[PDB]
């Protein structure tokens, strides 16, 4: 009875295709108005032409309703390409791992690309909640001109402006790539390449002062200048494996399509191909269902700008040695 929709689960150097197959192939999406017909594609070539000529060919052979993309790189240019793909075929893509999940604020108005990951404002909120836990109400901020810079500073200053407790923001600095100032708790915000040059001063650090940067600085946690005792916000890349995310992305596409058909009595006609175009209203309706998918009680909603509303975030300490020391679900910190 329930119609089948075609979801492409594309894995770029993303072993193992077996654990990913078996995990989802027991989820009975009946009790939904729509059930998914999943076709994995294992690829080794991660360039713009290969990714494009994979998506488009899959669209022209099979009826592709959704695409779920997982990656094994730290290349953000992946995400933009797929968000560029999303918009020109008005077909949903979910970047769930790797560069496909490297959050891309400010993207195409027509886009249906959504990423498993948090915003700059969300992790800033987690930082200030860490302080609210252990009473570090005196801090600074030190920022580069790298984008999202102000949005970060804006989020910090906002959450404490609209408050009664005694927050004391010392000094807010904006490096170029040089002055000295003494605050016990800081908030560094920059690129991991520029962070090392900034971290190269008084290896300011190492005595009685903690430093706290997000995923933008921690970067590839499995990869000199960085302080010991650095605390970071990052996405849960330890207890949330690729099978679990492929399966979650499937559930999101399938539930969105189902809710649309149970209300509008039709789901979008899959896209003819990439080459042809001619023969928008269907895309935006599904987009509305895509960003408000409640599954297993768990709220898997998205922002209209492409990040998750409630990402599984973790607070990590820096031997090697980034180690999880806290978890964040909804608006609380269990550390």
């Amino acid at each position: 009875s329930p119609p089948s929709i075609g979801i492409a689960v594309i894995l770029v150097g993303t072993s193992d295709e077996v654990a990913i197959k078996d995990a989802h192939e027991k989820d009975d999406f009946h009790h939904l108005s729509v059930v998914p017909r999943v076709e994995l594609v294992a690829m080794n070539e991660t360039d713009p032409k290969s990714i494009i000529t994979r998506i488009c060919d899959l669209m022209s052979d099979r009826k592709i309703q959704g695409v779920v993309f997982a990656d094994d790189t730290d290349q953000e240019a992946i995400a933009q390409i797929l968000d560029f793909i999303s918009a020109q075929t008005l077909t949903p893509i979910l970047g769930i791992h790797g560069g496909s999940s490297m959050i891309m604020a400010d993207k195409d108005e027509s886009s249906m690309f959504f990423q498993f990951g948090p915003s700059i404002e969300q992790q800033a909120s987690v930082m200030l909640n860490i302080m609210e836990e252990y009473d570090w109400y005196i801090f600074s901020i030190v920022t580069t001109y790298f984008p999202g810079y102000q949005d970060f500073v804006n989020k910090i200053r906002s959450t404490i402006e609209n408050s009664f407790v005694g927050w004391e923001l010392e000094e807010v600095l904006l490096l170029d790539m040089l002055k000295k100032l003494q605050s016990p708790i800081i908030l560094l915000y920059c690129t991991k390449e520029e962070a090392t040059y900034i971290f190269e001063v008084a290896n300011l650090t190492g005595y009685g002062y903690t430093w706290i940067v997000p995923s933008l600085v921690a970067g590839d946690t499995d990869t000199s200048e960085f302080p010991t005792g650095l605390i970071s916000v990052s996405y849960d890349e330890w207890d949330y494996g690729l099978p679990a995310r492929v399966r979650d992305g499937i559930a999101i596409i399938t539930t969105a399509a189902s809710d649309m058909l149970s209300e509008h009595s039709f789901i979008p006609e899959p896209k003819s191909s990439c080459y042809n175009t001619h023969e928008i209203y269907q895309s935006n309706m599904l987009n509305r269902y895509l960003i408000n998918v409640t599954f297993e009680g768990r709220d898997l909603s998205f922002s209209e700008d492409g990040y998750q509303m409630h990402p599984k975030l973790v607070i990590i300490l820096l031997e090697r040695k980034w180690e999880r020391v806290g978890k964040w679900k909804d608006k609380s910190l269990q550390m």
Binding site: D47, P48, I52, I85, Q88, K107, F146, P147, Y275
Partner: protein, 347 residues
Amino acid sequence: KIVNIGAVLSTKKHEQIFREAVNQANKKIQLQATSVTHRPNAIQMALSVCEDLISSQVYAILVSHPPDHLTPTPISYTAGFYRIPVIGLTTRMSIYSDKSIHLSFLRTVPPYSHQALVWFEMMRLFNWNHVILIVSDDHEGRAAQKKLETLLEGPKADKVLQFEPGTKNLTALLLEAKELEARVIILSASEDDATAVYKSAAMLDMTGAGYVWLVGEREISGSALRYAPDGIIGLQLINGKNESAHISDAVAVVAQAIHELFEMENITDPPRGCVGNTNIWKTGPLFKRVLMSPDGVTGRIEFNEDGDRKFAQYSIMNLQNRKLVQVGIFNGSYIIQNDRKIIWPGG
């Protein structure tokens, strides 16, 4: 070594100039030209950059937006996988200034947001210390708001009112401008958005004497000029839409920069095609750092921190008797008035 420099230009007439510009630029390395036209379907344009440009080991791609619907995004993203420097020549929308999305982009034209830099001076030239800023809830409009705000911050004078793009009836907003005792009004919208404001303002008597309409280039362009109010002041980028002069200038730029880059050491060869090359051009970021860090056909050629063009003049325009007049010119710092007299709305 042969160093080829790629281009995505308007028609064959312009690709001709580009190969001629490379020709008159070779005066150890030889520069050769590889050029294509735009592909109206942008997915195929992304594949054309792979198969016709990067397949030739390109060291930089230049991209002209023709006089709509063709953006440099397919070339920026594809070349932006590696970081082969992409030098836009025509498009001015500020989405291309965000370095966290467009990873190797320079452009010999200022973005539209930078036109706020002129209105600032108009205010400092007319003692306008209280403005109402009407902008579209769009990346470009808020780009104007953001830069006008920061250069005002030395934003009480800035009273912003937002409208959703595609809004035909704007009586509510402008009614609120009336309630806010509006005098000088700055507007940042698209062509067909500015048209909507223009008609809504000429129907509650908001274009007459006492009102000052200060406006950029898109709002005094195309459809919007026909219904733009009598007395409005617009802007116009000098040598802006002249694709030739920008090809010539940017070819001179990449030439000098190729020389400076080979003066350095350990410069690798760019990728040869997309399929198989999953890694990044190692000496790419350094090459663009060279490009961002002379004199030319369009003017003092120099870029800011984002790769956007610095030191550009604007034709300052006033709409006299339903016709655009140049009442002045924006040096690049000071703003200079010519012989013609200015007429405000109403007179």
